[model samples]
Target: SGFRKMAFPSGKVEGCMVQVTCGTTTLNGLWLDDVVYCPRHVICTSEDMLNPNYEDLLIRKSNHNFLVQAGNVQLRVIGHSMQNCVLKLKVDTANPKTPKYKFVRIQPGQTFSVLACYNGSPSGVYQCAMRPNFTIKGSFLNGSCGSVGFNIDYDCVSFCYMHHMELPTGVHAGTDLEGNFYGPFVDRQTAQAAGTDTTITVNVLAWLYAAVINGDRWFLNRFTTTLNDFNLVAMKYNYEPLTQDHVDILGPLSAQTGIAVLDMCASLKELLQNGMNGRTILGSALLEDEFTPFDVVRQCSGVT
Candidate 1:
């Protein structure tokens, strides 16, 4: 009751390697979000009542100086923990089929890749089945990304049933650990991936047992031209907040598409209008409060 204790991919990794966090429901004394990491990430459970600082637990990569930056994005520490870990960068070309990716272990600091490059052969929206040992099921619709960690507390349900929420697991778990409600990577081309040049910003955050992603931060960075255009063109000023008209144009297309405002540069609208565009939606380097640019790397090109 004080701190929810849970293990991912039960029986997979022995004691201590388990991931923990604060979550909504409890089952079998394990948290719902506790599951196996997808391809690269590893989960570490903290048993203390309060959230621990990531730096305190970090085993930094000496070669990279523990100062990891994807493209150019980076995370700011809140208190002691990173809360959100990110790397921001700019690139000329970002190919999803063969994306640039690598994972590092927290202990010895070893780096490895599951689906090397941008190619999402095993891509799609996936979950950080933290309890099940942090395994991932790539590419799904209306589903959350593997970035944001989920609840770390234990659930009273079992992990292999949809009734997991009631049975001692999670509301999201399937018939089996591999049961994917959504389709898998139909082909290497179907996986969803984000690239650079269009600025790339990502964060690694942990609240309780779950590590959650803040796509909104990424969204805020990319909505540069729209918000600025609203102020410059609509409001007729240097810069200001958005209006109903601006929100209408940029809202739904938030993560689905990338666009520009002022000059309509690299924007989804202009790219389609002018015809030179890639498929992937990029991340931003600036803080959420500031206006930043987002460009298209490659289009997902199929069903959401």
Candidate 2:
């Protein structure tokens, strides 16, 4: 058989590793620095398109118990508790110099978006409860459904590119005082000076390099071949020292190759104890799981 679907007892996320095939070959896990450029895609709801920064708004804060839109600065109850009990909303709609409570009610599956002075900018501390008398008491609705109004300056929003892989272009755009995309800047320092771009302050890409590449000795000597080594001088001079042409051609090569090496490392680990796919770096499958990370690292670096 050319290729066919294989199932794990555990589902995708729960599965430890995956296998993929093309033509006559099959493979396990990702090869070194190999990104599944054509990874699977899933359709989502209109609300999912909001593209919330799940890392920041996880678990409780990401609950779908209610639906709210910032345009009108109102929310509706979408949960099942609305038949007998009403959903109460308490918001600080007035001055933030000192906050005062304003109340609104939402019926089951009903929209209660009306506010006393709904300025229509999702701001202020919005809390909700199910009871009319105990808006002050009962459970302090501190989760996502509980808070409707969000400060544009602090909370997360969808569509902003927060990761390097997601950033199509090299330029960094700083966020405004209200946390909107201010604009794109030419260099890292320029964006940093704007006070809203926090990539430098947070140092995100460095963490990505550390965790994803895993600093395997196989990857140590290969930087000159990839597009990453120039970053040292670029950072020292506080500018994007590399040309776009070089990046356009070489960046993906580096990234994909790096991931291929990582796959080999994982493969060796699994063989010793336990283990770990797909169109990919090494034609039909990764060059072979038997190759050590260092072996491929040296070969890719032209050590042969």
Candidate 3:
């Protein structure tokens, strides 16, 4: 079997969007940790595979360009595909219901938002969301604000007073997408959106999919941060943490839609520490991460 052609959500020429390299599994199919690809005459008569709907398939094809950033404790209107769109920015303090915000028109090319002007300068663990008042043009833009282009719902937009953390700038290294995985390789994707949404929404699907495909440690860190941030917002609002349901829904909507090395033994401890759910699913971004599993248990049950 040669190349098993796959269509990219970006709708670019096949094999132009996402490319991966993978070691063969015991069954001889290429494996990307979570995703597997069968070469050529693939046969899977399972009902689930056979009955999968286009909604899920369409999600795989949506390559919308959604970018966001919050700086100086204030959420900024960083980047998006919609031009001449009216957006309302709702804000909140540590609580998801904080009543403070600003409105701005996302123009063709301009830096929007009144950053660092809020009552509480650099509000602690803030939240925010952006609601588009007009119709999304959905037209392909020519990489106005560092976005290569847009096709469909790949962009994730929301309204809330989410914490503000900006993406780092530099030439970062990535997993050898072309070498680590099997044939049909492409360039590593840019983390443009970086999941800059106010809630646990689809802003992350694009990067998550790419992380699985690329198997890069740097990319994995980004995905972990997004999930952790989502946990922060959810825990604050009294909701379940990461579950299959969250992935099943938000994971697919993208069509619409990490780690670190510590010092030896100390590093391993830090790596595993990120997985602790803190009983309430608070994000690693908060004081929650400062506590260990024992601390979480003790905090949740007083004098138990």
Question: lDDT by residue for model 2 over 204-254, one digit each (tens)?
Answer: 122222323333222222222222443443344342233344233333434
Off by over 4 Å in 2: 1-181, 184-215, 222-304
Task: Give the per-residue lDDT digits (tens) of candidate 3, residues 37-136.
Answer: 2111111113423343423332332112111122223222222111111111122223222222221222111111111112122111111112121111
Comparing 1 with 2 on lDDT, the higher-scoring candidate is 2
Candidate-wise lDDT, in order:
0.21, 0.22, 0.22
lDDT tens digits by residue: candidate 1, 1-304: 1211122222211110111111221111111121222211111232421243334434442212222112233312111122222111122223222212122121111111111111111121122322212223222222121222111113221222111111112212222222221111111112233211111011010110010011222122233354444334323211123344444433333334333233222132232233322322223222111111110101112111
Error of 2 at 140 (Å): 31
Each model's total of backbone clashes:
94, 12, 23
RMSD of each: 21.5, 23.4, 25.0
Which residue segments of model 3 deviate by more than 4 Å?
1-197, 219-245, 250-304
Q: What is the TM-score of each candidate against the true structure?
A: 0.18, 0.17, 0.18
Q: Which ten residues in a row have the lowest lDDT in candidate 2?
A: 32-41
Sliding window of 10 residues with minimal summed lDDT for model 3? 13-22
Top TM-score: which candidate number? 1
